[PDB]
Amino acid sequence: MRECISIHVGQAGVQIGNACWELYCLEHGIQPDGQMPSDKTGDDSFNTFFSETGAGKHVPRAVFVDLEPTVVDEVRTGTYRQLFHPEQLITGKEDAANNYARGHYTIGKEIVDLVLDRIRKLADQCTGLQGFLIFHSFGGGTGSGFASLLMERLSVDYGKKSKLEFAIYPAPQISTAVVEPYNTILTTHTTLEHSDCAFMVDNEAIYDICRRNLDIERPTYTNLNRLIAQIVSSITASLRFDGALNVDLTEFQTNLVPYPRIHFPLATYAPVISAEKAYHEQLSVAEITNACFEPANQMVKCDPRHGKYMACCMLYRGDVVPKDVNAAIATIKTKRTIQFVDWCPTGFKVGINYQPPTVVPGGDLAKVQRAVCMLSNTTAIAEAWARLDHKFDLMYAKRAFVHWYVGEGMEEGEFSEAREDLAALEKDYEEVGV
Amino acid sequence: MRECISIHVGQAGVQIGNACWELYCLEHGIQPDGQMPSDKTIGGGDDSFNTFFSETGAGKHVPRAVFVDLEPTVVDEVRTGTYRQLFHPEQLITGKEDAANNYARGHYTIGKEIVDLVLDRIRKLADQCTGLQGFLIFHSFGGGTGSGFASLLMERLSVDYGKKSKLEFAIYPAPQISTAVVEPYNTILTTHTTLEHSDCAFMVDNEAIYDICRRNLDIERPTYTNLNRLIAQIVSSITASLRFDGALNVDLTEFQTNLVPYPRIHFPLATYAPVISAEKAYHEQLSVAEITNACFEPANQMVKCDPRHGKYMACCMLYRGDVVPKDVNAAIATIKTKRTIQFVDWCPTGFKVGINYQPPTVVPGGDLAKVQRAVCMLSNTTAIAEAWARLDHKFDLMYAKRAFVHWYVGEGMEEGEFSEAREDLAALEKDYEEVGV
Amino acid sequence: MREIVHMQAGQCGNQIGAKFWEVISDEHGIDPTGTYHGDSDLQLERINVYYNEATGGKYVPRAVLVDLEPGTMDSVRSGPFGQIFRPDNFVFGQSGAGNNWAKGHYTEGAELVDSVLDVVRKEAESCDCLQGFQLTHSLGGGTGSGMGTLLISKIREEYPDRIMNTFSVVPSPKVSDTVVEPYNATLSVHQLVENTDETYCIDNEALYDICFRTLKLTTPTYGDLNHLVSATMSGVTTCLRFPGQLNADLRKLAVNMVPFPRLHFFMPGFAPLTSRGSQQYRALTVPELTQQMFDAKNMMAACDPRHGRYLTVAAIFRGRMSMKEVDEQMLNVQNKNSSYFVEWIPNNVKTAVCDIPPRGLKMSATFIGNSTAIQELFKRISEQFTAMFRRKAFLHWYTGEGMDEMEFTEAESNMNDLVSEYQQYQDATAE
Amino acid sequence: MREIVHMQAGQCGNQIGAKFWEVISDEHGIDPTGTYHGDSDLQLERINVYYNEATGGKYVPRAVLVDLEPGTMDSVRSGPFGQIFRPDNFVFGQSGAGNNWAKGHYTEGAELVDSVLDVVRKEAESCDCLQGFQLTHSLGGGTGSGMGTLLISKIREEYPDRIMNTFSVVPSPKVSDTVVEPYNATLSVHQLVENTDETYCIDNEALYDICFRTLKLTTPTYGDLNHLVSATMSGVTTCLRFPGQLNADLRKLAVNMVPFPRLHFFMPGFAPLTSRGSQQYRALTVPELTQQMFDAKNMMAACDPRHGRYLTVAAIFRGRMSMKEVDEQMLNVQNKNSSYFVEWIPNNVKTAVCDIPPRGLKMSATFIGNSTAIQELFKRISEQFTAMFRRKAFLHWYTGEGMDEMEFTEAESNMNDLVSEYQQYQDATAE
Amino acid sequence: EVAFRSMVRGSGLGEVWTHTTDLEKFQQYGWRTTTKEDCYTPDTLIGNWNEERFDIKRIRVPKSLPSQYDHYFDTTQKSSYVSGPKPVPKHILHLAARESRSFPASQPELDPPAVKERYNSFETTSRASYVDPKLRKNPVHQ
Amino acid sequence: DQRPGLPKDLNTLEKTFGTPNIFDCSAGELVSPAKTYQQVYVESEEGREL
Ligand SMILES: Nc1nc2c(ncn2[C@@H]2O[C@H](COP(=O)(O)OP(=O)(O)OP(=O)(O)O)[C@@H](O)[C@H]2O)c(=O)[nH]1
Ligand SMILES: Nc1nc2c(ncn2[C@@H]2O[C@H](COP(=O)(O)OP(=O)(O)OP(=O)(O)O)[C@@H](O)[C@H]2O)c(=O)[nH]1
Ligand SMILES: Nc1nc2c(ncn2[C@@H]2O[C@H](COP(=O)(O)OP(=O)(O)O)[C@@H](O)[C@H]2O)c(=O)[nH]1
């Protein structure tokens, strides 16, 4: 009755979806061919991610979409070939070349109807859809233009239902591309007004977490995507399994978004640990709650102590006794390092689930009794917005890399409008903070 | 001694009879082979099956039914399935060509050769009787053998047997849910012919039983088997007075004399209504007042018409099981004091009740629960005038430009028979307003 | 125990008839030698409708193959499932018509008419019920069109009441393939419209469109089109062969379909159709079959039903399903697309649910549509005919056989009359 | 007949109702198959108060379980004592309010409330003398503060003569556990002031303190809190259920406690409470029971009795005990504590002793206390409401759904009037 | 929203076909012969290579051992999400002939026995429901 | 490589790390113990003679 549709936009979204669906098949006991191992000895928790087209086979409620047919072709020829729906792996022909204009105006206008028809068929098969989980990046092209185009063309059709966004936000001092400031400025102006909860995960933050808490000095994107897959599994395990008081995709909007223009929390899955450290540790509720407010165990590279906490959503998973959560939150409230905003005496949404987390054979995380995922709305993101504002101003001072957008179809004033929208967002964050 | 002959004509009739006779075998304890597997048997009083079965003198029972269809597939399904040795091979009457949803083919040309053979078989069954209680005709108004040949057979029976009970159970079309195009032509033609040759015309609607199965039994996607089982339960509740001993036994003659006020108002409504499923059946009291109030509900009629738009004239209440008369009297008093149930001004004594000892039996291949108390409500009222008007609307808007008429015209029937039938059913409607006012 | 005699005329008729007799023999569990190897009894219950009993467990198809040249008869007998036919039902001559309707209907066809009528009379008197005749041929050919319509006329003269349906591979707008195809098609349909009870009008370009857009297969070849046509023929005739909840034979379809006797040109459609990669993932449900059945480019006629208005519709479902969902979906599609159905016929959709799914599938549906969109095909053939005829092109071949231009002018008049009847019904108002 | 229609709304309400039905079926001897296997007929003598005899002499509770999503509803059905509930009374939605009082009161919560009113109309019609209605929900939550208060309003309109006793869980001073608790709590208590006859508020950290201190329990999770509240649930109805020396029904308790119609928020308390190790060291007598009742560590609400005045005390004793034991133990408490009781009500303790103790206890006692100590909890919730409403945080959901700021201001003003009435009757002197 | 559309149909990779009108259908994919994405082996990733590799004639042949110089061709989404070689079943590899199909490319060999039994057992409603009412009070076991 | 920090044999993904939650003497056997009425009457009439 309670199902979610996972749209994966861009190469990063497709690889995140690879890790996420591997984890989903693992924790629901689904082989890569789509079959249960039977074994006789009533599980039904898959009926939020796996449509049971009745033959003994379960198919995902996922739409992989991309313009470049490389990473989706890797999925289509890889190990999860006989599991995904063949007409749910939508690919274009041309790439997008980190161009918001080529992802929103030129290449993607002939394929948006196809991806929306697949989404419409999935929703018509669905029977009480909570919402969509859209995995993408603000790097550019498909993840910037096409994902935003999906935001308007899904909000104008459906509305109402949740649209949770998993953005790979650009890092402060490092990145891969160069026009990511332009793409990130252009994405938010068209994505902000049509969204419900759009939270961000940063590459430097995962690199620090993997190098420190996991002792992976040379981590690839596989560890990053697995570590985000654990976050999404912990954010939907309340919908999937039973437990204590449960937080579905409806309270995520009304408990984390105080004002309509500010919907930007931060993830924090923080019993992140390796085998030796977990062997010598006795991981308990107070420790795993105190490990979530540390600036080292943050999923974005920002400064949380130079900011005021708006709201928090605790998602506990495993052998969690409820009063230990309340004692941990009481200790956090008496702590001075964590600062809350004044118009918020009550500021936590606590939800406990009984299902222990699952470990992937071959990986980095260890099997642990307890898990905590914070969804924390704070005012610390204004520093990141200000530094990308500075990057955009430096690149737009003498019209660097503008001719591509202008010749592709983007109007010159669109950059100014997105600049004004980000300036309004900075003023909104300042007014909230004061 | 109180014996009835069942004539199941058409594919719908054959399928409804296939459900009805397995219900009868389950009720009387007869195995599908034809004998009683009671082994110890014991005499006592064991003549309850004589309404529908006859001794062969060797322990086998053959039913008093004739299965008629002009095409050889739905009867051969019966002859091939597990109820093969139960039926006598001569009662399974089949043709060569089907009547092709055509009243003319069913009534004039193809129906003219096999009518003599089926009349001969009915003659043998009537000779194998010690006093015939009546005929139970089962057909569909949808078209073909169930519409043309049924009218031909009942007019031949009216010529031959004369004064006899002629209860029919008609599959009337729904306002929207139907599977044919020339079906309103077939209905308009058959309601003109079977109006003066019948005495009770119990009407059931496919969409209405669909809504019943979707609401009460909560069968979202049912087949014809469930609908046939519900119709069989209705017919079993009707014939329970003839078959099993009870306190107040309402036979066919008592039923008609208490039901029909006029000879052309012989069109009642049936509602057997403990109809809830075995899941949500054993958490409720299921009292006599409860099941009577379930019968007297607008969204329980098994023909698609709202009884609040009309006036009740007669009601017959057939109770089944552990039913005491004081609860019957209290329930009837509450129904009479209810104001949304309007009775017509000229019928003060609007109820005729009758209680049978035997409880309903559960069919293991079905979905109705093993209830202890049952009531089947048969009301003669004026709420079917809107169904008649919808049928007239369909017939008029097709007959305005003479669509599909050439199949009837060039194969027997003349052109003006449609006009005559429309005039006859308009007169029937006018009769219904004269009785209603 | 009904009977339908199958007749194949021409190269197209012989090829898709051979595919038909492959598919229904696989349905009834008959090996290519002729014996019965089925595992059930419902296959053998109604095997007499198309197979005459022979010595032992052999089962001879009730098919008559006719073509003036032996070039396709030798191939259709030597191919797979070709040794099951009776060798006496393979009538052939010396010369060939070859897109020469005049030769197929008047000079070379007329010599073989006596022999093929003797064979068909032999089969019909071997029958004991004889529900009707099905003829498979192609409009736009010599032997299929001309001699096929001549056989249609002779069988209508012999038996004026037994049912008759022609499957009628029809010309397409852009495939063409023949320069005298408008002449052959017009002269054949002039006979068909007055001498046929059910014309089905299957289109080659439409079949390519279905087989490529729905089934992928960038090499859609020839036997695949034969397989699609055979699937539709089997889905049409399945109620005569198998038990079901609500059976409907060819005469029930004709009565519920044809409002007026000249409006009998249909649009076939088979719709549990899915791609090779999508078979293990798709759910064969009744609403989904209804959607694919009423899908516009799932029609095997090249004419779009959106450019018209449906008069009558038949849906032959096969498999175990729920009647409530079936007719509820027909109610839903009528109330949604009420602008594409005539307002003066209520319940435009007849239903026929049989309980035996086709082999290899769980649940199927066959579509018949008597839409007024086939007037586009008729107008296309009319305009090509009047483009060729106004310059007297290719007419000496036809007039050297004993034919005059009066027949061509009559064919113009009859096709234009039929166009007028289809034209006025899509816009005639009730009141 | 004295029947109470029971309702569970929200996740907390559904779980605590399931635990209450488990413990009351344990008290009345009903097994998970709905039959009776008790030892004394006194369990059967007044089954009709909450159960409903089906066919075969089985018993089904008169409980309406409602939630906007199938969640805890399915958990209750799959758990123990789940098949005893009527499947018709498992009314559910498909959407989700989720801490969204506007959505639980004006969206899909407001259309399924017609079905819930129909269910309670059937349950009340199938009775002879209804005592009243009780409902379990949670202020500061989702659907419990939404559909729960809507149900209270509509049922009070339908039957404005029956005793209405909401239990409800109020928000906790320590921890947060939901951010919109002040908004939902104010909007729910604005309905609960004028509609409900009596409310027995539950507070989660008070339950945590009473589990950790007076029973140790290490980790009792949520089910044992539900059990320890269900003890008081049965405790203040056991005079209506079982006979005894002095009987006090719900109406008698309501008139004997409530001084003025606004003043009807009580604190429950169960006090044969022992730890595991001290149960063999403690002696169970009526003075010890009264000591544990009037102990401030047994208060189920976030309230300090020392910072306030007890308006009225109700004491439901269970077991075989003397009468002036109870009478003198309340006389002694009143004489020892003259500064914590209101001076204008002489002997404000209402005592009632029943003859049947609960399971496993020789004697037991339930304390229900109407005080002015609720003022601190309500001024906490009011100041939190003002703190959020000054900056209009989390208000856009409610306003963009359809309520306005006027409703919030009226709710805040009404609850401030309630606080002012508490302070006025606390500070009012006798003469 | 057009009326008689069931589902928009995509091309081998990205192109959609105009379901409304048939005017450019000979320059859409398929009928277009100026292109080249039709005459390659299914190893290459153009055309409907997925649907060609989903065919029986490519499933029946199994994969070989990895070559010597496969470490130069190892991939992150081949070494992270590790997969064993697929043990193609004997009832597929020893397929003598295609059994009774119904439409082109209607391959029922890959279907599991749970759905194969549904059409291999001739399920008719009257016989299936009006069976002896003593075998329906308890289920039958294999 | 994670081996010499861990013990000699430990199958990493098979052993759960952290502390368990011991579950004894819940309030269901403290608030309302299952001791009927005759048993608690006997256990309470023990004593009284002294
Ligand atoms: N966390 C994570 N981030 C990734 C991964 N792969 C790519 N990225 C991010 O994606 C950015 C590169 O641009 P993409 O988002 O991949 O662009 P795209 O979505 O493929 O769309 P195009 O413009 O057409 O290439 C890098 O800066 C990375 O931060 C991944 O596997 N995990
Ligand atoms: N309730 C119910 N109605 C049925 C059943 N079978 C057929 N019908 C009705 O019958 C109508 C179709 O006409 P048929 O009764 O099958 O016609 P026929 O009696 O077989 O006679 P022919 O048309 O000559 O074959 C449909 O509209 C159905 O409503 C059934 O099993 N139960
Ligand atoms: N769909 C389909 N069309 C065919 C087949 N064989 C021939 N045709 C078409 O039939 C037309 C030629 O008709 P033809 O067979 O030569 O008629 P004949 O001369 O009487 O044999 C051509 O346009 C072909 O496209 C076939 O097996 N399937």
Ligand SMILES: Nc1nc2c(ncn2[C@@H]2O[C@H](COP(=O)(O)OP(=O)(O)O)[C@@H](O)[C@H]2O)c(=O)[nH]1
């Ligand atoms: N005593 C008790 N309280 C609970 C339980 N589950 C949730 N709660 C309380 O219920 C409040 C939240 O209400 P909620 O269940 O979300 O309302 P809903 O959204 O309508 O289901 C919180 O303050 C919890 O303290 C439980 O099992 N027992």
Ligand SMILES: [Mg+2]
């Ligand atoms: Mg890319």
Ligand SMILES: [Mg+2]
């Ligand atoms: Mg029939």
